[PDB]
Design a protein around this nucleic acid. Structure first.
Ligand SMILES: [Mg+2]
Ligand SMILES: [Mg+2]
Ligand SMILES: [Mg+2]
Ligand SMILES: [Mg+2]
Ligand SMILES: [Mg+2]
Ligand SMILES: [Mg+2]
Ligand SMILES: [Mg+2]
Ligand SMILES: [Mg+2]
Ligand SMILES: [Mg+2]
Ligand SMILES: [Mg+2]
Ligand SMILES: [Mg+2]
Ligand SMILES: [Mg+2]
Ligand SMILES: [Mg+2]
Ligand SMILES: [Mg+2]
Ligand SMILES: [Mg+2]
Ligand SMILES: [Mg+2]
Ligand SMILES: [Mg+2]
Ligand SMILES: [Mg+2]
Ligand SMILES: [Mg+2]
Ligand SMILES: [Mg+2]
Ligand SMILES: [Mg+2]
Ligand SMILES: [Mg+2]
Ligand SMILES: [Mg+2]
Ligand SMILES: [Mg+2]
Ligand SMILES: [Mg+2]
Ligand SMILES: [Mg+2]
Ligand SMILES: [Mg+2]
Ligand SMILES: [Mg+2]
Ligand SMILES: [Mg+2]
Ligand SMILES: [Mg+2]
Ligand SMILES: [Mg+2]
Ligand SMILES: [Mg+2]
Ligand SMILES: [Mg+2]
Ligand SMILES: [Mg+2]
Ligand SMILES: [Mg+2]
Ligand SMILES: [Mg+2]
Ligand SMILES: [Mg+2]
Ligand SMILES: [Mg+2]
Ligand SMILES: [Mg+2]
Ligand SMILES: [Mg+2]
Ligand SMILES: [Mg+2]
Ligand SMILES: [Mg+2]
Ligand SMILES: [Mg+2]
Ligand SMILES: [Mg+2]
Ligand SMILES: [Mg+2]
Ligand SMILES: [Mg+2]
Ligand SMILES: [Mg+2]
Ligand SMILES: [Mg+2]
Ligand SMILES: [Mg+2]
Ligand SMILES: [Mg+2]
Ligand SMILES: [Mg+2]
Ligand SMILES: [Mg+2]
Ligand SMILES: [Mg+2]
Ligand SMILES: [Mg+2]
Ligand SMILES: [Mg+2]
Ligand SMILES: [Mg+2]
Ligand SMILES: [Mg+2]
Ligand SMILES: [Mg+2]
Ligand SMILES: [Mg+2]
Ligand SMILES: [Mg+2]
Ligand SMILES: [Mg+2]
Ligand SMILES: [Mg+2]
Ligand SMILES: [Mg+2]
Ligand SMILES: [Mg+2]
Ligand SMILES: [Mg+2]
Ligand SMILES: [Mg+2]
Ligand SMILES: [Mg+2]
Ligand SMILES: [Mg+2]
Ligand SMILES: [Mg+2]
Ligand SMILES: [Mg+2]
Ligand SMILES: [Mg+2]
Ligand SMILES: [Mg+2]
Ligand SMILES: [Mg+2]
Ligand SMILES: [Mg+2]
Ligand SMILES: [Mg+2]
Ligand SMILES: [Mg+2]
Ligand SMILES: [Mg+2]
Ligand SMILES: [Mg+2]
Ligand SMILES: [Mg+2]
Ligand SMILES: [Mg+2]
Ligand SMILES: [Mg+2]
Ligand SMILES: [Mg+2]
Ligand SMILES: [Mg+2]
Ligand SMILES: [Mg+2]
Ligand SMILES: [Mg+2]
Ligand SMILES: [Mg+2]
Ligand SMILES: [Mg+2]
Ligand SMILES: [Mg+2]
Ligand SMILES: [Mg+2]
Ligand SMILES: [Mg+2]
Ligand SMILES: [Mg+2]
Ligand SMILES: [Mg+2]
Ligand SMILES: [Mg+2]
Ligand SMILES: [Mg+2]
Ligand SMILES: [Mg+2]
Ligand SMILES: [Mg+2]
Ligand SMILES: [Mg+2]
Ligand SMILES: [Mg+2]
Ligand SMILES: [Mg+2]
Ligand SMILES: [Mg+2]
Ligand SMILES: [Mg+2]
Ligand SMILES: [Mg+2]
Ligand SMILES: [Mg+2]
Ligand SMILES: [Mg+2]
Ligand SMILES: [Mg+2]
Lengths: 54, 123, 119
RNA sequence: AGGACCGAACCGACUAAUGUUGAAAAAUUAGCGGAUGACUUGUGGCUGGGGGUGAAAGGCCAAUCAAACCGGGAGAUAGCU
RNA sequence: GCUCGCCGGAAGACCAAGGGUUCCUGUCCAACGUUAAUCGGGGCAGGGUGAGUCGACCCCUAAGGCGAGGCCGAAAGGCG
RNA sequence: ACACAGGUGGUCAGGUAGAGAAUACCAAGGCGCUUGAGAGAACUCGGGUGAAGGAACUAGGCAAAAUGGUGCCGUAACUUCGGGAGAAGGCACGCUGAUAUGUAGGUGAGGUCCCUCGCGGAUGGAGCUGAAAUCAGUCGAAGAUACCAGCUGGCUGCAACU
RNA sequence: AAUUCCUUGUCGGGUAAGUUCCGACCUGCACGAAUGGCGUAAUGAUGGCCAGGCUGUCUCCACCCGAGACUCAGUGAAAU
RNA sequence: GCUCAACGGAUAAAAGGUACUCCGGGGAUAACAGGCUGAUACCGCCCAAGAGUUCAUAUCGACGGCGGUGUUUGGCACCUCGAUGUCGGCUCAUCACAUCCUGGGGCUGAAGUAGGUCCCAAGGGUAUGGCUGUUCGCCAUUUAAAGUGGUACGCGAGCUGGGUUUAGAACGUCGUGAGACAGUUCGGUCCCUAUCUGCCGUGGGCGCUGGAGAACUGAGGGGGGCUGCUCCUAGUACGAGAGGACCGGAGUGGACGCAUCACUGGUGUUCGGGUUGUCAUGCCAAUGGCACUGCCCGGUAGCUAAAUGCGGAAGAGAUAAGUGCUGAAAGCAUCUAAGCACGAAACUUGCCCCGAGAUGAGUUCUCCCUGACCCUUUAAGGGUCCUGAAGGAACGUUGAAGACGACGACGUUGAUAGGCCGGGUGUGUAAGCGCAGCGAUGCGUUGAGCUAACCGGUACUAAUGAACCGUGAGGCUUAACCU
């Protein structure tokens, strides 16, 4: 099963339109550390909801 | 659940012991046969001197089934083997005068009053 | 299909999944905190928390069953000595899952699973 | 004792399935036959193209064989595309 | 480093064929590894192969080749 | 042509079971085979199980399923008298104790006689190894309990057979 | 008949039913005696038929265990 | 001087095989297929000599004639040989009516059942086996019935390779021979990850003119429409008798589909237990690993069928064949020309589902922000500050929802998931101890121990305070009302 006519750049772009990326809606800030981390995840130092775990 | 090519024992004393079912009566695409369902069988193993011989083709009724019957309350009554009773192609009446083993109450009808009476036990 | 079922294959057979979970539970008991993928950290709770409730009642049969499950005397001894009285007041909840982020080699989610009474 | 038997190494490839722009330009798994003899294998040598070999299939002769490969005649010829 | 699994008449250890540094150390991460890589049989530099007793060399020949002269053949050459 | 599911000659041969270089689990030793994680749709491949029938499916019992080991009784037509034949079919198989505080058997010491006299022989059983068989009891649905491990018979054409 | 177009020649056996199988009839299109004929103990990864057991081959599929297929991260072709 | 006779004569002189085969080419030219016609094939119609006890036409139809389908065997060779893959079988269907059944009707040499012929009607259904590679066909037994044909003699980028059709070999026949036989026999590689149309399902964007959350109207589309047997009517009607009703009701079942796991069972390699070989935990005991889940025995939830509930409609409207009422043209007659009525599983509704992108973009109940500034291009204008609502989106716990998307529930004002308590179910007297037995082993503690997906509860843990998107009263013209 192979193609019979060469597709176009328009069709290629239409197909790739749904292949885009979605960025992060917003970031979270720790109450005491003031950093920026992902939602429900820990920071790069070991802070989560103000407490220290590392 | 009796179908074609199924091997059955014989409950009556007409001279047969092993029979092979070839058709199931009742309609089109009829494949399963329970108790009280008329089927057609051929004779594969028969006694030397009996009312029938080997190779005869005739109707029969099912009195015992390994699959078993199902009462309305859910009580299922099964057996350890599949046995049938021979009949006549025209009159559909039993040939032998005895019925070996027990039978089920889901068999009694105006056509089979001569089987339950001869059976020593009815369930 | 998968309806009302439980358990996760994790692209492994039973003989591998049981051994991996046993090793992970032993490491978690030994270190009080480990880092692993989120599904593994979630499925390890169902193996470790019953194992802690078993140690909550000290006896010979319980220790024998724990040894059958873990194959580590140095782990079962600690489980029956320290974790037992430590979690004797908690009605479950012997683990705490904190998301770590992702990974470089496969970009899989990562998380730290530890004991609630660690620090 | 046996061109004896069952069955491993070893040799071979009868059936099925996978694969067939394959792990592989003929293989993999489950089975299979011979397995002390007309057996198999290592090393070395010999038999060559109208010729060699062939328990004989038009089979093999360096993945190519109803006449091997390289160079030359040669820019063979082509009423054919 | 602590656990799990596998081969174990091998998926272990020596070799002859064959390959020709691929063996060890330091160092590197441009190209290679069907991904990354601090790693590697990948790049660079350095080091490493010690025999009267092992093998090759050497004595002797089998199949077989060459072949003084010799026989034969239009040349070449063939046989011995 | 590849860091390729292929091919390549010689030597060493451990233990428990076991007839064994078959097979299972392991020691010395060597590896997880250079992309992983996640959920667990259709569908493809390698498999497991299955209510009743049991080849009715299909060109065709293709494939799949099934017996499958030791000891013993016993085994037809036919025949070139060798065979068929492992014919077909059937029974025992675990463990404990006793027979026998480990038997039959095998190996075989110290100590005894002489002796050409030593790496010697008759006597002797110490010690070690060690089946198979019978009786009684016992546990499980199943004791050749796992891997490994013939399906069988009858008729017939062809080729004698390897 | 490994050979027979007419042919599924006719009868019998097996099957409830048998253009396949076996035993007979001979009307041999177009068997035939060392380009050999008849039969034949044993043997065939040989051709055909029947039977016992055996089973998802099926009646009619159902569930489960793993590898792919599905999503994410990296590398990244092809026939046309 | 040449039957150079192939006679304008290629040489004084010349036969065959290739399925071991090869090259250049041709759809200029072959077979399957497609195309044109329809000699043939099938079907329909016309006169009526007759058969039919008389009587042509209840039912057949000569000697003859006229037409339709393009379904067979065929004619031409127009497309394809710089490839359109072929018979049969399996799965999958769809359309047609010259209909096999069901439905309705006319005639009958139709007393009744059972029949024969013809018209309308395609809504539904339309068999399992032995033989053969076979379609076809023979036979066995059912069925209400086991339809006719088209779809490249439907369907190999869906499957199969039994035959036909390559290379091997053999038989019979022909050929002196290489070889040949739609004569036979044994065996003999069927590749493709879907680019576009199509189809089955699931989504993102935007629009529907302010935005958001919900419930619907239903234009339109899709699914189904099959029927046997017994009894009552009634052994009545009919018939001298065997025989045996139309219409109308009741019941139980076969094939098909939808839904479900309460029950009957399968699976249940995540539960329990038995047991063989081996290794390990210093050793006994007790366990773990491996040998298909090592081999097995049962089995929770879930998924399932073989299991159990349900459906095929009743009824209405307009109708075909058909039966009629009144009634003239034609003083009668006449179903028709005016008018009226009955009439089939055919049609539209009625039963179920999808469904306003139905751009003709629909309807209804609700909720939401009623702040100011300046600039040229004076407008459906551009920009600034403040504001960020209803609601949605994102992350997380997740689901009897699901390929990814999507949908549903929850998120500290909470039972969403995990864990825990109790219970339930399943497996089956756990380990340890003591007693009896030399011992294997049994007994009491003990229906004990364990218990996945189940139930009723429990914040013990994880679902965070936030942040983001989405705005700030909504264009022009006209009709009615209130100012
Ligand atoms: Mg094209
Ligand atoms: Mg895309
Ligand atoms: Mg759940
Ligand atoms: Mg994976
Ligand atoms: Mg295992
Ligand atoms: Mg031999
Ligand atoms: Mg060979
Ligand atoms: Mg072969
Ligand atoms: Mg093999
Ligand atoms: Mg073998
Ligand atoms: Mg052998
Ligand atoms: Mg050599
Ligand atoms: Mg040559
Ligand atoms: Mg030459
Ligand atoms: Mg040949
Ligand atoms: Mg070659
Ligand atoms: Mg060749
Ligand atoms: Mg030549
Ligand atoms: Mg020249
Ligand atoms: Mg040229
Ligand atoms: Mg192992
Ligand atoms: Mg081995
Ligand atoms: Mg090299
Ligand atoms: Mg180098
Ligand atoms: Mg190195
Ligand atoms: Mg280095
Ligand atoms: Mg880098
Ligand atoms: Mg790289
Ligand atoms: Mg490579
Ligand atoms: Mg290097
Ligand atoms: Mg030497
Ligand atoms: Mg010499
Ligand atoms: Mg000389
Ligand atoms: Mg010489
Ligand atoms: Mg590699
Ligand atoms: Mg290799
Ligand atoms: Mg060994
Ligand atoms: Mg799967
Ligand atoms: Mg199986
Ligand atoms: Mg089994
Ligand atoms: Mg079954
Ligand atoms: Mg069972
Ligand atoms: Mg069964
Ligand atoms: Mg059977
Ligand atoms: Mg058959
Ligand atoms: Mg059939
Ligand atoms: Mg087989
Ligand atoms: Mg064998
Ligand atoms: Mg004969
Ligand atoms: Mg024959
Ligand atoms: Mg032979
Ligand atoms: Mg002979
Ligand atoms: Mg003969
Ligand atoms: Mg014939
Ligand atoms: Mg006959
Ligand atoms: Mg014969
Ligand atoms: Mg003759
Ligand atoms: Mg002959
Ligand atoms: Mg002759
Ligand atoms: Mg002669
Ligand atoms: Mg002769
Ligand atoms: Mg001969
Ligand atoms: Mg059979
Ligand atoms: Mg993918
Ligand atoms: Mg390219
Ligand atoms: Mg002349
Ligand atoms: Mg002329
Ligand atoms: Mg050509
Ligand atoms: Mg043409
Ligand atoms: Mg044609
Ligand atoms: Mg065409
Ligand atoms: Mg007349
Ligand atoms: Mg034609
Ligand atoms: Mg062509
Ligand atoms: Mg072309
Ligand atoms: Mg072709
Ligand atoms: Mg009609
Ligand atoms: Mg219609
Ligand atoms: Mg209708
Ligand atoms: Mg048969
Ligand atoms: Mg066709
Ligand atoms: Mg086809
Ligand atoms: Mg095509
Ligand atoms: Mg063939
Ligand atoms: Mg031919
Ligand atoms: Mg002929
Ligand atoms: Mg495909
Ligand atoms: Mg949308
Ligand atoms: Mg259920
Ligand atoms: Mg339940
Ligand atoms: Mg059950
Ligand atoms: Mg089970
Ligand atoms: Mg169940
Ligand atoms: Mg064990
Ligand atoms: Mg022990
Ligand atoms: Mg191990
Ligand atoms: Mg009138
Ligand atoms: Mg009138
Ligand atoms: Mg109806
Ligand atoms: Mg209970
Ligand atoms: Mg007890
Ligand atoms: Mg136990
Ligand atoms: Mg106890
Ligand atoms: Mg008790
Ligand atoms: Mg519990």
């Amino acid at each position: 099963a192979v193609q019979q006519n060469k597709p176009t750049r328009s069709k290629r772009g239409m197909r790739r339109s749904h292949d885009a990326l979605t960025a992060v809606t917003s970031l979270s800030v720790d109450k005491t550390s003031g950093e920026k981390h992902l939602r429900h995840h820990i920071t790069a130092d070991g802070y989560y909801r103000g407490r220290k775990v590392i | 659940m009796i179908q074609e090519q199924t091997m059955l024992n014989v409950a009556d004393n007409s001279g047969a012991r092993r029979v092979m079912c070839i058709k199931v009566l009742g309609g089109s695409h009829r494949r399963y046969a329970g108790v009280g369902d008329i089927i057609k069988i051929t004779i594969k193993e028969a006694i030397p001197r009996g009312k029938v011989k080997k190779g005869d083709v005739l109707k029969a009724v099912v009195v015992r089934t390994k699959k078993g019957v199902r009462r309305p309350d859910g009580s299922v009554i099964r057996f350890d083997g599949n046995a049938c009773v021979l009949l006549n192609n025209n009159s559909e009446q039993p040939i032998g005068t005895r019925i070996f083993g027990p039978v089920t109450r889901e068999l009694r009808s105006e056509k089979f009053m001569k089987i339950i009476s001869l059976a020593p036990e009815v369930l | 299909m998968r309806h009302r079922k439980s358990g996760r294959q994790l692209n492994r057979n039973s003989s591998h999944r049981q051994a991996m979970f046993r090793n992970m539970a032993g490491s978690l008991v030994r270190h009080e905190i480990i880092k692993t993928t989120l599904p593994k950290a979630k499925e390890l709770r169902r193996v470790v928390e019953p194992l802690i409730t078993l140690a909550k009642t000290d006896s010979v049969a319980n220790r024998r069953l724990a040894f059958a499950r873990t194959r580590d005397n140095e782990i079962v001894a600690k489980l029956f000595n320290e974790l037992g009285p430590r979690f004797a007041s908690r009605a479950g909840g012997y683990t705490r899952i904190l998301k770590c982020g992702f990974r470089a080699g496969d970009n899989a989610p990562m998380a730290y699973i530890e004991l609630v009474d660690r620090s």
